[PDB]
Each structure stands twice: as structure tokens, then as C-alpha cells.
Tab-separated table of C-alpha atoms and ligand atoms in Angstrom:
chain	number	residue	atom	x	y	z
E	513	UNK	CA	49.138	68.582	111.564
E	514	UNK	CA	48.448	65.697	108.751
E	515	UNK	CA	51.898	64.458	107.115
E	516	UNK	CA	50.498	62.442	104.530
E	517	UNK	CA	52.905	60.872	101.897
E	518	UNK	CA	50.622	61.861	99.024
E	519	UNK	CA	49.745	57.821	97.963
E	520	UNK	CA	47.559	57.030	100.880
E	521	UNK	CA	44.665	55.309	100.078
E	522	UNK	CA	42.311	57.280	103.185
E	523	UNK	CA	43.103	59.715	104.943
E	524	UNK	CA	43.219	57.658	107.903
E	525	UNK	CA	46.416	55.696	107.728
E	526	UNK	CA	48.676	59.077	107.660
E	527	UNK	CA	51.773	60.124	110.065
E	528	UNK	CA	49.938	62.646	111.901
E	529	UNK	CA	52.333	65.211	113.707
E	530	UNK	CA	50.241	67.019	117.362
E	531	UNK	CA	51.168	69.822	118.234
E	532	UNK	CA	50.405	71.132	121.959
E	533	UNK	CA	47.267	72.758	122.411
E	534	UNK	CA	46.448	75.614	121.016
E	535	UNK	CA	44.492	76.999	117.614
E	536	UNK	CA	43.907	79.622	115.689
E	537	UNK	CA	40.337	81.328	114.900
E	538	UNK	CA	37.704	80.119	113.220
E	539	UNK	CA	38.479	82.688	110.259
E	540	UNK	CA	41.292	80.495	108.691
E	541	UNK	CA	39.651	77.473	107.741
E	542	UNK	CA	40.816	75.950	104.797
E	543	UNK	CA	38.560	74.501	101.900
E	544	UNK	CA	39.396	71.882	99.266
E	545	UNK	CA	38.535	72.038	95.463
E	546	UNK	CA	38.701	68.573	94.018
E	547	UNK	CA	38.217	67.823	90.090
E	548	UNK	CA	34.835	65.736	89.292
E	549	UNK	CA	32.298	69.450	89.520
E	550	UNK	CA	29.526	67.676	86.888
E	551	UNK	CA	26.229	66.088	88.100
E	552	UNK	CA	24.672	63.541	85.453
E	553	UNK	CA	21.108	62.302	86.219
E	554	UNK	CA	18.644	60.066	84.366
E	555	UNK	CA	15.326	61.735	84.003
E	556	UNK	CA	12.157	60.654	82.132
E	557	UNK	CA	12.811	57.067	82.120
E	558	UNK	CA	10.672	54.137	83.259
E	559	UNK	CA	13.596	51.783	84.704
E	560	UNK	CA	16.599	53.330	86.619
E	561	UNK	CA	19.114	51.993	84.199
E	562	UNK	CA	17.886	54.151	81.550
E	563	UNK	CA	17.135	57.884	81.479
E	564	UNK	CA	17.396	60.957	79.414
E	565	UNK	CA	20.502	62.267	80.493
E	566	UNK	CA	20.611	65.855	81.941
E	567	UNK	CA	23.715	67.779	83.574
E	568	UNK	CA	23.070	70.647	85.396
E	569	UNK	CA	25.161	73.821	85.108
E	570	UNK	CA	24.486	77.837	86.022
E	571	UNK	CA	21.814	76.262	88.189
E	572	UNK	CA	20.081	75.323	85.928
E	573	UNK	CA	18.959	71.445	84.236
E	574	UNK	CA	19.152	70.818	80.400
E	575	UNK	CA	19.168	67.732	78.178
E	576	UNK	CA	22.612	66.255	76.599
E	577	UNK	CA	22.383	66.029	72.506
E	578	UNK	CA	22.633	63.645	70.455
E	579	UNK	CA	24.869	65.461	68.329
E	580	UNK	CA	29.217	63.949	68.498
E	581	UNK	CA	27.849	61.156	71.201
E	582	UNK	CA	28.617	58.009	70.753
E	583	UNK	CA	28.860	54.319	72.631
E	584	UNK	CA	31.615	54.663	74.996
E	585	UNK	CA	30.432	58.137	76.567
E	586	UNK	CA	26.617	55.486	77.463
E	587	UNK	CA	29.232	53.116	78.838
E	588	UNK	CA	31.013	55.228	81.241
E	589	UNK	CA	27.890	56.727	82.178
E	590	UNK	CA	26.446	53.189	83.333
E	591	UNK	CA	29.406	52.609	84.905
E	592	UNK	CA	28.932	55.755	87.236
E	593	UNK	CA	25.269	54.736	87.472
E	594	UNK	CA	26.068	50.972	88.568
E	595	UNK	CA	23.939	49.558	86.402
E	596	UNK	CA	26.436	48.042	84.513
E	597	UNK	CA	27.342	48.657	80.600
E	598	UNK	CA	25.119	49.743	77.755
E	599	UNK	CA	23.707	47.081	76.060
E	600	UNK	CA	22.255	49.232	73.006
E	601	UNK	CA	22.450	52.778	72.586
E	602	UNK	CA	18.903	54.168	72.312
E	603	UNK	CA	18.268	56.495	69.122
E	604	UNK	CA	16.212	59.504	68.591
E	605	UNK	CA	13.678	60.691	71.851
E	606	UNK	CA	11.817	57.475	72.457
E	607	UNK	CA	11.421	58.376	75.820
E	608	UNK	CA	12.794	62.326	76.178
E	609	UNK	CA	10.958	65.010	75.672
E	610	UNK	CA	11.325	68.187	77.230
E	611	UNK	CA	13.403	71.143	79.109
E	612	UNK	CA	13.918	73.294	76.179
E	613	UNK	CA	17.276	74.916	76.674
E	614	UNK	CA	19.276	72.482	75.372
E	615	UNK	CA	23.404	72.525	76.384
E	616	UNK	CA	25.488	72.213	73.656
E	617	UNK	CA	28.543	70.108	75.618
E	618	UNK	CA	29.626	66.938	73.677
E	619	UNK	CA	32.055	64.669	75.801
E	620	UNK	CA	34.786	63.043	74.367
E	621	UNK	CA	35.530	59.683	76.517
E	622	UNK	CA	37.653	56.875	75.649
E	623	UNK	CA	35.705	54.725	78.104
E	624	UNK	CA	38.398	53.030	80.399
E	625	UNK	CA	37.788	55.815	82.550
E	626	UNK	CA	35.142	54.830	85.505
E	627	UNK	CA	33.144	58.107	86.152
E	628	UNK	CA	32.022	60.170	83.293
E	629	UNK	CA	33.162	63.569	84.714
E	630	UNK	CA	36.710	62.045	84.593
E	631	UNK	CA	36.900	62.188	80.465
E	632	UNK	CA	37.738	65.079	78.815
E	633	UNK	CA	35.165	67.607	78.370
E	634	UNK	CA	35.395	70.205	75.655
E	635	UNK	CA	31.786	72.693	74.926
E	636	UNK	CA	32.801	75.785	73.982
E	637	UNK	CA	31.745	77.437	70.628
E	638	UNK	CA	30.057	74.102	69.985
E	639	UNK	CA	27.237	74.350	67.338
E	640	UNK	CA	23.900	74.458	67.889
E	641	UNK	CA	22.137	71.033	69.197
E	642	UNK	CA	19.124	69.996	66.045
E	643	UNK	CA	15.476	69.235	68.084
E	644	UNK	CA	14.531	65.713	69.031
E	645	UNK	CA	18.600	65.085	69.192
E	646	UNK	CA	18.519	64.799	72.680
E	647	UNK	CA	21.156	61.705	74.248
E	648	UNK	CA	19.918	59.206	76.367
E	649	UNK	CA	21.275	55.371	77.271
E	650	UNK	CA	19.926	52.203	77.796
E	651	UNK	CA	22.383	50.607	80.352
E	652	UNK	CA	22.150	46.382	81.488
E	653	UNK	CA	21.033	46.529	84.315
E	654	UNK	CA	23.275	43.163	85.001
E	655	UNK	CA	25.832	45.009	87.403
E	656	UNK	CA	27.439	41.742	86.434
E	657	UNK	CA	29.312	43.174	83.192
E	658	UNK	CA	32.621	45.004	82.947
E	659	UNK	CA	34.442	46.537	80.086
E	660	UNK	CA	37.067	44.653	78.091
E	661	UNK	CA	39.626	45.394	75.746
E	662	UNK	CA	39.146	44.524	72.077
E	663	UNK	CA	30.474	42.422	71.702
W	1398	UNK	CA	81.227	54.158	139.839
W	1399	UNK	CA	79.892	53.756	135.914
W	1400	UNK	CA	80.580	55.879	133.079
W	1401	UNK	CA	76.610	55.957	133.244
W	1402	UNK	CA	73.904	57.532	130.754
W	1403	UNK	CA	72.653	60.868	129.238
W	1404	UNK	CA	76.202	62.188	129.290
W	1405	UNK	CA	76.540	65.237	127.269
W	1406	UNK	CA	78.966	64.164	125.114
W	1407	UNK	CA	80.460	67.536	123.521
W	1408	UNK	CA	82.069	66.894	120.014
W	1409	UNK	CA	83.521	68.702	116.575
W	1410	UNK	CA	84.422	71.498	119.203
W	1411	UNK	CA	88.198	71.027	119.416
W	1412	UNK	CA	88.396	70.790	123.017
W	1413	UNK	CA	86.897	69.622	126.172
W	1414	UNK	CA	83.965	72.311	126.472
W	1415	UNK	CA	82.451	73.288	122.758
W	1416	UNK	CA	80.800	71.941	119.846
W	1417	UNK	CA	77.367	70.148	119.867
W	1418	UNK	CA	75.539	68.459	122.814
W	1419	UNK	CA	75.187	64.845	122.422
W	1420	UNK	CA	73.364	62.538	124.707
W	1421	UNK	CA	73.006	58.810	125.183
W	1422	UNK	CA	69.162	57.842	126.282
W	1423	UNK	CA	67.841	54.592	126.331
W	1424	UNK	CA	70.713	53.348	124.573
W	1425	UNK	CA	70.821	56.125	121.918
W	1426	UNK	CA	72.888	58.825	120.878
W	1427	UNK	CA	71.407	62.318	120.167
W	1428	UNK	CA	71.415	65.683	119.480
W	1429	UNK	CA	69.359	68.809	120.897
W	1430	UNK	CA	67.156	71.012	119.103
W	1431	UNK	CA	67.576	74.682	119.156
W	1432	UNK	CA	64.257	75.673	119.496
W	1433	UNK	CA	64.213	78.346	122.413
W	1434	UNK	CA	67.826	77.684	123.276
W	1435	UNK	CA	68.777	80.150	126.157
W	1436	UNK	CA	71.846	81.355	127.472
W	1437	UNK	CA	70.586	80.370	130.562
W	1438	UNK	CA	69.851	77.100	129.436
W	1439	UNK	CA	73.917	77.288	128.143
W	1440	UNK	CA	74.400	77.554	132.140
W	1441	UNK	CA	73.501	73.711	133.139
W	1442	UNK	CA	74.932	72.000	130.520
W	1443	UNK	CA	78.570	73.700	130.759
W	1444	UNK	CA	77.900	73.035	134.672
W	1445	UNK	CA	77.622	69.239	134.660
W	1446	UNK	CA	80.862	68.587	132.274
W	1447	UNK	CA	82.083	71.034	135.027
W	1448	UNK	CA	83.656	73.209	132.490
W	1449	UNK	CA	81.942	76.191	134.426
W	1450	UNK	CA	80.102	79.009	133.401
W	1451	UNK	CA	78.729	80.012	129.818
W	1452	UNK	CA	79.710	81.734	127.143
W	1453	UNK	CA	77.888	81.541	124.251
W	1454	UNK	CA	74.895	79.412	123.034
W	1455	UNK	CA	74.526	78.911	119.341
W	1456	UNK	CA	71.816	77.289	117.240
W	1457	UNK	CA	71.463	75.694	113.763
W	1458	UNK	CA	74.510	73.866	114.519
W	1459	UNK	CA	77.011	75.870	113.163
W	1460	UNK	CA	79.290	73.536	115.192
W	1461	UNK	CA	78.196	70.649	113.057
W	1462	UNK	CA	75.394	68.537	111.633
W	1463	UNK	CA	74.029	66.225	114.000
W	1464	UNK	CA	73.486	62.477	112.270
W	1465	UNK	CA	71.425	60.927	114.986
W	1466	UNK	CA	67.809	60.986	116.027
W	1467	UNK	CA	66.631	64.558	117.695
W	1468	UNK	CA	65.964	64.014	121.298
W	1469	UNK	CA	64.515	67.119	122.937
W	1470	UNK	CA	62.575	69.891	122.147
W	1471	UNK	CA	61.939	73.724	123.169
W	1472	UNK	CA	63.838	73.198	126.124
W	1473	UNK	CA	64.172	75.867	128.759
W	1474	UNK	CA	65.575	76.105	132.327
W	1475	UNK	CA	65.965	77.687	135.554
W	1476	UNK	CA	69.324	77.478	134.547
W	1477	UNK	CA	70.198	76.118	138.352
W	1478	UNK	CA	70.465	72.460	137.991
W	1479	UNK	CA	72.851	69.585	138.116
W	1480	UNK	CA	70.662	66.982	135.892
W	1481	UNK	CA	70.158	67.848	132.677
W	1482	UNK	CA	67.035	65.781	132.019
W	1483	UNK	CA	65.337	68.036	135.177
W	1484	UNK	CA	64.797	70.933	132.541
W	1485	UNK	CA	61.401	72.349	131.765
W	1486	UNK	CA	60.613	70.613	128.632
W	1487	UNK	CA	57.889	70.296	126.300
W	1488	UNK	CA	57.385	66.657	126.256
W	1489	UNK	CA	60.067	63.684	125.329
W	1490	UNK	CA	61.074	62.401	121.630
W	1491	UNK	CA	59.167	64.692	119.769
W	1492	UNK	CA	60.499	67.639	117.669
W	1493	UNK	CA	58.760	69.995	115.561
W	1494	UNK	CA	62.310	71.011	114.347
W	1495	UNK	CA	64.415	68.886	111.870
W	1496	UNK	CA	68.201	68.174	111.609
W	1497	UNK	CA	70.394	71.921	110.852
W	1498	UNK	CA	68.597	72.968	113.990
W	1499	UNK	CA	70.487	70.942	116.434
W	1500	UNK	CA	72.224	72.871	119.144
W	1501	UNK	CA	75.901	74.625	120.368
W	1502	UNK	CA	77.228	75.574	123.109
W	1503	UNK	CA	80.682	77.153	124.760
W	1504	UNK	CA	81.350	76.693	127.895
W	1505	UNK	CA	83.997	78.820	130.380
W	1506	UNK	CA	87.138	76.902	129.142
W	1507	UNK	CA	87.533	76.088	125.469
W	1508	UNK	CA	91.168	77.354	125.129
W	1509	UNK	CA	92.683	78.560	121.519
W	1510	UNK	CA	96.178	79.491	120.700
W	1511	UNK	CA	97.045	81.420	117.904
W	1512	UNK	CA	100.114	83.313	116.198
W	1513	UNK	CA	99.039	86.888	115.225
W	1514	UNK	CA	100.819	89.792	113.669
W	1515	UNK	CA	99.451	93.039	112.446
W	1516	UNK	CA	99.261	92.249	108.563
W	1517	UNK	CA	97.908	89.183	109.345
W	1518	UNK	CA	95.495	87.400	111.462
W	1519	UNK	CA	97.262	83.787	111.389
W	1520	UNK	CA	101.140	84.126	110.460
W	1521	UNK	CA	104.145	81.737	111.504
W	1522	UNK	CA	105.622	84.863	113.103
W	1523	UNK	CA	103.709	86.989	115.866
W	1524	UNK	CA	102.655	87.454	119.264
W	1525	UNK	CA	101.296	84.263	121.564
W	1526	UNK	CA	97.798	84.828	122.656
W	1527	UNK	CA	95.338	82.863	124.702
W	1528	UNK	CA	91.459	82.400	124.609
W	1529	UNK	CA	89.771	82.456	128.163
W	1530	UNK	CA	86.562	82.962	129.194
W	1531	UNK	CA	85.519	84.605	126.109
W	1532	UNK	CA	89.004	86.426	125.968
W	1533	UNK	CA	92.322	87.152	124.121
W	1534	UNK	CA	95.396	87.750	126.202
W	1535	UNK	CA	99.065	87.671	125.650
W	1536	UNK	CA	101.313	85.199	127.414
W	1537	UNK	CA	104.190	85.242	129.737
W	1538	UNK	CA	108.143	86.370	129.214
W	1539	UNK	CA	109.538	85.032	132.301
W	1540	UNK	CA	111.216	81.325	132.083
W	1541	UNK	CA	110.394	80.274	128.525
W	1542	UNK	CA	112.547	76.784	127.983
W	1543	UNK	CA	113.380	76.079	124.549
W	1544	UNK	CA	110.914	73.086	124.738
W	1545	UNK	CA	108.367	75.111	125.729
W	1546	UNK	CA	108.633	77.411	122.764
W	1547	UNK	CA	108.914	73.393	120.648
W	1548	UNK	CA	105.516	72.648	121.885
W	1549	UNK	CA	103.573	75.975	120.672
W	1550	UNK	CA	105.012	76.299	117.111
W	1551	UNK	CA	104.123	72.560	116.789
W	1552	UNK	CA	100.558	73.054	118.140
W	1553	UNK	CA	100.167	76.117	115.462
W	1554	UNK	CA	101.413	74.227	112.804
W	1555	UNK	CA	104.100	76.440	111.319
W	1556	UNK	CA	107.552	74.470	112.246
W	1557	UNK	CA	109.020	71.801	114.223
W	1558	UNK	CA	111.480	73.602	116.088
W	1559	UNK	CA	111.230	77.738	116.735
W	1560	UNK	CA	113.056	80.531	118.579
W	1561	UNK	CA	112.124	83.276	120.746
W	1562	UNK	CA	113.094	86.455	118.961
W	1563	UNK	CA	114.033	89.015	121.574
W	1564	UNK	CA	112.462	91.947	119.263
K	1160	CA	CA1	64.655	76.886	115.108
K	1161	CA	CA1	64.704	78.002	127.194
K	1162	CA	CA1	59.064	73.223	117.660
């Protein structure tokens, strides 16, 4: 039985408490729900460090828009990627083009936040995304750059 | 010829035999856990203060709150022993209960006096009774000094000096 203070940094330095031997059944099993539930990928792009960016939700894989996105949202998403800030924010569909169905969700990130599924999200009853709109970044590719208060 | 260790150091009782359980392991003073506390378990502890037999074993200490460290754990016994450490335990030093679950115990002989009429349960003015083995019993007539009567009204509480009211 784990006794863990709540700050521990693993799970391994924790007061753990044995009982004897003994168990119960396999049926009670317990299962852990932890808060980051979005997967962001780079597709279509000719270097890693840049990509049209796609999340996938209802099984499915559709293309961010353009549409409410700004610099900070690229940032954080470099910073997830590891390729360090974005330089430049690409505009237009220089290098997307395609999937369709287009979701709608527009992220609102302040940016000192280090993975992108840790800002805010709000998508419903957004509008409708305009064609050729579809977000993308153009990240360093230093790994050597890190954000700073206030190029 | 030492006062020794692990003696089970009986406290907040009021007497010789009640109370908690407290004993003194490598140079520590501690309390029991009630976890499976038996009456039979009551027997060996009440046997090596050689107060006798057992009464009554109580958990959650209702006697008192024990401050120190928790020592032992889901003890139980044969109930036929003189050391108190040769019980069938579950280990050494580790508890899965907390503090308010320390244990109690009365032994055969944890005498109590009181001064009872029929209106009330504790009055200044009554009959003398006795606690034994789990018992109430009224007390002798015969050769009754007046310093003996001095003693009981000053154990009670109610006066320094009394009289024995033939009525
Ligand atoms: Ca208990
Ligand atoms: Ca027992
Ligand atoms: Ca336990």
C-alpha cells in the first residue's frame, strides 16, 4: 500500500506501507485518468521541425485552422516537439494540403506553459474554419532557444 | 535483581491493575494496538503484574490516549504464558492501526469504593460498597473504629471526619 505525500517527484521515493500476503482478484484493478488526452503531430512537412499540424479526435485525423491562432500556440507546440521555438510563423498552406474534415478547435495558450495540451482549450460552437486556412509552424530547429519574458 | 525491560507498565487506571498497557523495548515506551485484542489475550498480561485473572479487555483506548510510538500489532495468544513478548504476533514495529486504537485491560483486582444511596448513584450519605473481581458488595458491621470510618469518607471525597449512623 503506496503512502505517498502527494509532492513526490516519482513514484519511487514514497513511504510504502506491506501488508502480509495476501490479494484480492484480478477484477479490482484500479485505472488512472490523467489530464494531457490530445495528440499533436506534424504531417506534410519536409523537415521535422515543421509540419501541418493535425490532432486527432473521434478516431479520426484533421488539420488545425488558421482561424484565432496565433504565435505563442507555434511556440508551445515546438516546445512539445523539442525543436525549440518558432522562428516565423508560416502563413497560408505553403506546404498543407489535404484531409478535408477540418476541426474547428482554436487554442488559447499564453505560452509559458511547456506542452500544448496543458493551455486552455475551448472548441465548442466555434465557426466554421475558411479553406486553405489550415495552421502549421515553422519551429528552430536550434533546441538551443528558450522562451523569455518581455525578438 | 533489576527492575528490567518490557514491563507492562499499567497507567490512567487508578490502581495497580487497569488502564492502558505500556511497555519499555529497546529503550522505548509504548502502547499496544487493539487490533484482535482477546480476552484471552487479557489473561497473560493481568498474569505477569500478578494481578490474576481477567476481567475485561477494552480497545480504542477508552482508558486513555497513548502518546508514544505503537509497538505491536494483531496480537493473539494461547493465553498460557508468563512472557509477554512469547505471544503469537504478526511481526515487530509495524502497525496497520494508528493512535485511538491502543489497548485496555482489567485485571482481577482493580478495587473501587463508592457511597451509594437509592436517589443517587454517588451521594455523601449511603451504603459502603466494594468492587472485586468484576463485583459490587457491601462491607462489614463488626469493629468499625472511628478512624476507620476517617479514612473512607476522605477517600470518597465528601468530608474530613464522618460518623456511622446506626439507621
Ligand atoms: Ca481496530
Ligand atoms: Ca488475539
Ligand atoms: Ca492491522
Amino acid at each position: 500500500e503506496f503512502q505517498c505525500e502527494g509532492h513526490e517527484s516519482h513514484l519511487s521515493l514514497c513511504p510504502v506501507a506491506p501488508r502480509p500476503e495476501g490479494t484480492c482478484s484480478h477484477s479490482r484493478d484500479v485505472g488512472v485518468v490523467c489530464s494531457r488526452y490530445t495528440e499533436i503531430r506534424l504531417v506534410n512537412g519536409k523537415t521535422p521541425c515543421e509540419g501541418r499540424v493535425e490532432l486527432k479526435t473521434l478516431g479520426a485525423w484533421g488539420s488545425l485552422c488558421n482561424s484565432h491562432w496565433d504565435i505563442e500556440d507555434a511556440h508551445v507546440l515546438c516546445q512539445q516537439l523539442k525543436c525549440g521555438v518558432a522562428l516565423s510563423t508560416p502563413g497560408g498552406a505553403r506546404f498543407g494540403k489535404g484531409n478535408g474534415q477540418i476541426w474547428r478547435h482554436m487554442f488559447h495558450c499564453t505560452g509559458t506553459e511547456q506542452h500544448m495540451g496543458d493551455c486552455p482549450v475551448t472548441a465548442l460552437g466555434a465557426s466554421l474554419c475558411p479553406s486553405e486556412q489550415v495552421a502549421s509552424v515553422i519551429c528552430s530547429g536550434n533546441q538551443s532557444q528558450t522562451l523569455s519574458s518581455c525578438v | 535483581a533489576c527492575i528490567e525491560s518490557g514491563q507492562l507498565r499499567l497507567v490512567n487506571g487508578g490502581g495497580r491493575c487497569a488502564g492502558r498497557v505500556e511497555i519499555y523495548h529497546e529503550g522505548s515506551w509504548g502502547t499496544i494496538c487493539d487490533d484482535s485484542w482477546d480476552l484471552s489475550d487479557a489473561h497473560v498480561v493481568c498474569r505477569q503484574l500478578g494481578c490474576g485473572e481477567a476481567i475485561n479487555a477494552t480497545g480504542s483506548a477508552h482508558f486513555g490516549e497513548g502518546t508514544g510510538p505503537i509497538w505491536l500489532d494483531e496480537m493473539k495468544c494461547n493465553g498460557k504464558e508468563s512472557r509477554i513478548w512469547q505471544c503469537h504476533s504478526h511481526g515487530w514495529g509495524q502497525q496497520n492501526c494508528r493512535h485511538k486504537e491502543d489497548a485496555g485491560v482489567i485485571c482481577s483486582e482493580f478495587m473501587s469504593l463508592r457511597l451509594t444511596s437509592e436517589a443517587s448513584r454517588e451521594a455523601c450519605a449511603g451504603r459502603l460498597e466494594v468492587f472485586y473481581n468484576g463485583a459490587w458488595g457491601t462491607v462489614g458491621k463488626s469493629s468499625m473504629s472511628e478512624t476507620t470510618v476517617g479514612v473512607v469518607c476522605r477517600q470518597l471525597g465528601c468530608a474530613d471526619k464522618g460518623k456511622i449512623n446506626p439507621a
